[PDB]
Amino acid sequence: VMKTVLMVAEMPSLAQSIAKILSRGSLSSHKGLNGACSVHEYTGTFAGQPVRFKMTSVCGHVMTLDFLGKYNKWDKVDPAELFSQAPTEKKEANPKLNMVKFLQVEGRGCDYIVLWLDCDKEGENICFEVLDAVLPVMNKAHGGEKTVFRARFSSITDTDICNAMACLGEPDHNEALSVDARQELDLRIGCAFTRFQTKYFQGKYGDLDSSLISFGPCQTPTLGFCVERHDKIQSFKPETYWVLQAKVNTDKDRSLLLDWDRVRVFDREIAQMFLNMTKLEKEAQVEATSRKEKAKQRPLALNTVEMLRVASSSLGMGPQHAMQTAERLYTQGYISYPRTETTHYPENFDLKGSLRQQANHPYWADTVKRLLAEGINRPRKGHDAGDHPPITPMKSATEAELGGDAWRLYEYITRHFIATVSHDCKYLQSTISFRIGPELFTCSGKTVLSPGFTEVMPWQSVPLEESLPTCQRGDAFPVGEVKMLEKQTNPPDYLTEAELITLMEKHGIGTDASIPVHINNICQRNYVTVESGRRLKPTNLGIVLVHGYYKIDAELVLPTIRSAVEKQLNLIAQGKADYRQVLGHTLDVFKRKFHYFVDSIAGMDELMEVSF
Template sequence: MHLIIAEKHIAAKRIASILAPGKTKQVRVSGVDTYEYESDEGKKIFMGLSGHIVKLDFPAAYNNWQKVEANELIGADIITTSTQVKIVAALKKLGKTATKVTIATDYDREGELIGVEALEIIRQVNQNIEFERVHYSAITPKAIDDAFSNPTNVDFNLADAGHSRQVIDLVWGASLTRYISLAAGRLGKMFLSVGRVQSPTLSLIVEREKEREAFISKPYWELSAILKSKSGEEFKAEHRTKRFWDKEEVDAVMQKISVGDEALVTELTTSEKIDKPPTPFNTTEFISAASSIGFTAANAMRIAETLYTNGFISYPRTDNTVYPESLDLRAQIEIFKTGAFKQYALKLLEKKELIPTKGKKETTDHPPIFPASLARKSDMNEQEWKLYELVIRRFFATFADPAKWETIRSKYDIKGEEFKANGARLVEPGWRWYYHYNAPEDRLIPKMEEGDVHSVTKVDVEAKETQPPGRYGQGRLIKIMEEMGLGTKATRHEIISKLYSRAYVHGNPLQPTKTAVAVVDTLEKFAPTISKPDMTSKLEADMDRIAEGGIPEEDVLNESREMLELVFNELEKNKDDITESLRAGLREDKIIGKCSQCDSNLMVMRSKRGGRFIGCEGYPECNFSLPLPRSGQVVVTDRFCDEHGMYHIRIINAGKRPWNLGCPQCNFLEWQKSREEEKEKEGGNRERPKSINDINGIGKVTAEKLADAGICSVDELCAADALELAKVTSIPIKKIKNWQSEIA
């Protein structure tokens, strides 16, 4: 029996349908769906994994944070545990009787490791099994047929490189996270995550925020005039002094010119600007383009993976920006001679030669991202179609002609003051006809000649201020990470997702929370090695050398442990200072604003029963408080409510969209108002219950459940998030909403 192993179930199913169309039957093995058919060579069985089916971990004895020092993890044994019991059981069962195994996982570092993990499980029960490897960049009939016709060897060096990353990230992440979290007193779900790639990336974001905070805006003024040509067309001209830094200077010019003055055309220059086509998509460029049309990095890669496994695009994890000679580019375009992109494909196919653009990076593992097969809009959801279309249009654009613009530069004399106006008109769309994203618009000015006279219809001065450097968007941040050697094409978007999930950043562009600033400040001051990219980029380079067979994995692992020992030496020298620095910084992240009643700080607090609320530090003299949702991390933003003296807050729950709660006081008042309006609509003359036990349907047991969830008063029940409360108490959400409606 010949066993073929793909990385995911859907890939196994598609590969089976390509190699044996209409002949496979679905067979369940140990709870896992497989696909088998009888060939001339015997039975073939296709099965999919679920990515990694095993994980690395420390022995259970190391799990107690209070008893095991963080630095003990550096040299601790690392064990492998199963994460997919059914798949492992199926592999062993099928592996026992298999005579040959083909590893058909994705062809990259991670895919090679996933394949080797499966192979090692099979070799436990069938030590002498024959095995081979197939490489493909798209799950299409041609790509799969070619791959299985030309099998190669498993690359154990590449798998070792992937394994070394897992070990290094586990040891660095677990030990540093434990140390920093214990120092800060942040345990449980609120622990402070620290990582080899994560922390230098977070440092980039924090440093940019500090640049913004240190930036001092400088006022300036812009002077413009609206001119009217003889034909009656109006357009805008700007003073030759782009920015006036002295108000008196711009006022002096304003006194010289006025509506009705003549504007003499003193100079007119027309030229042509060539706009070159874009280069092919690699992962970084794809994420950047997807980000510009509204996709987060993680979402873009998740959807790209779906498009790939369904055979619609090529493998989306690639550094390559040069199409390989082995790719039949004309045939690839011909796929789209029918369907939604027919007119674009036919236009390209008119070319005698199809010469694509080339980027700076050329690799041999995978080609740049390209559309692999024709799809209809009904084959996918709206988001998938948007990214599928993006890939198609980018692919087409790389073969298209340059775009050409006609540019016009003009100068005018108005009472001795020089004004300028620039125009641009797209005369040959070229590649922009295929790839219309973020296209600049025409800036049209009337036809004119030197010596023409226009009239001034309006003069305007606009007061402005210089702006701080912008925060990083996800696409831009991933490009910087790539430049600095932080992470890989397969992991950078995951690092950014982790920063969001740990409530280190919020929004897009990314804004760091005060917790993030506290962690980075502490690391940069007392253990700078962790927050700088040098160490992690060195390890990334070493992992590349493992993949190339230039250095043994064990050497790199030993080197990484030595680096980490030095980091811990830095930490231990400054242990007390680190604790003080972290706790002082984290306290700031709980400050919501000033109390309107006593001017003390309003803080995120917890009740004795675990409930969460905004309370006044002046308690017990001041008992001002506001309710908060029970679950989710509270993120204090930099938006400020002047009316109530509080910062806006966000609530972040893993796997859900962030909830912009806004100013807590405004939110509470709005909630009260809506309740009163509902009550009026119902014509409610009912007396409001004074305690939880007065509410119809709440007995002793239910009241205890609510109390355990931090709901001890009628007001707290009113303000509670019904869905979250239902999850915590197991009380039906409908019943909770009925109570809230009754007591409103």
């Protein structure tokens, strides 16, 4: 006769890890009805009395918001009833996994529930979905004793998990309400605009028949970025530079190519006058020197955005493919969670052990042994969003064990980790100033003193250059072959995936797990094509769509309305507003926008006609 507690985690790996940490080696595990989640059992002490423990997991969201059946027909509802005269219900996601029945059967006899879900904003929504699923089955309360608990945690270690188990709290309802409002707004906007656009353009122009034209708070701004870059590329007028350079042949062995102080002149006559007052001279007089000492900063902790950017730039992999490779590596047990945002190592991390494991690879052996022998530099402090620890290696690997596609990702991850643990790079910069008549020139050079992370990240290395000659002020050197060079401005090139990811992160469009999905969606809808160098080129459909959007109502494309709506929705998250009021106001303003849009589509048709 002793009570039982039930603990739900957001992923089976997290569930097993927390169970093993809280249970000192005694853990009885068995599979469940789903076959995708496991149940772990242990005996401990909770609320001053002996208790049995039961740990289980749920794979992400349990439910998603969808319309009723009658309004999912696309041919019996006016795409304006979706705003204020359409009921919405929550339906199971991944129905093959009977999450609701699994939770109901596992929570038949429990007295306390502890939600070990992620500390994200949607973690609370998942918490309340689980509570809705489980609560009507729990064995009463038998008084005023509290039965709902939530633990706040960010790192998977011993001390942090123990402190979280000692510092329980309560869940939050306002965050769940905010997430629900966001879901409802997104559905009732996208499913209303997409239906109208698809049903319209499929009845006039037959070229794009059996094609889907989608609108949303993320896809449209993402396409707008690329088409606006295309607009800059098209609207460009090249100009003509005029740069002046000179050569000095001091010490009779070296020919220094000096750089003009004034970097460019846009007038031919002015450039000619400067050239005239300079070339009839046969000496160059030194004026000043410099021997300043600088340093290149070591990289910060790894983040999903940086990993995606590097995979797209250097390794030449798409965001979706990189995410799939990272997920497979994580589920096989080689790297941590590949969807974090934190750039700050937890204070209780086992950095020394993680670096000590990779002490046998022929690539890093010398560097790792040197670091372990002469101590480790502390990592740079960064953002500490309470989502997950950064991406760090967890097990040794060899090129034979892993495949030729995941080996490069693993190599980059471990090299980044070693670079973060390692020292900095120190280079001496020397600048020498010359005078040839009225004008001035400068010559610059670098010489590395003590390489740091360079030997682990050889592509982020200072180039080797010949050391500048010694010279004190007042010395004179022979100068020859001063001339004028003509150059023209180069137009900008199309957006790359790295730049698009940077822009999306800056403007707050899409989450960590949503950027690859949105990029793949805009690639699949034939809005943008992918060319050499991982460049995204807009197509005719995308160009005409965004131009029509700008001509009709630009507020649907500009990359700030998403941030404004998020700010408005934060009000109910902080308790300063009302869910019904905010949702009604936003739905009303968007409905007015849709009604203005519907009777002004000729502006987009007049641009569609010439394209198709």
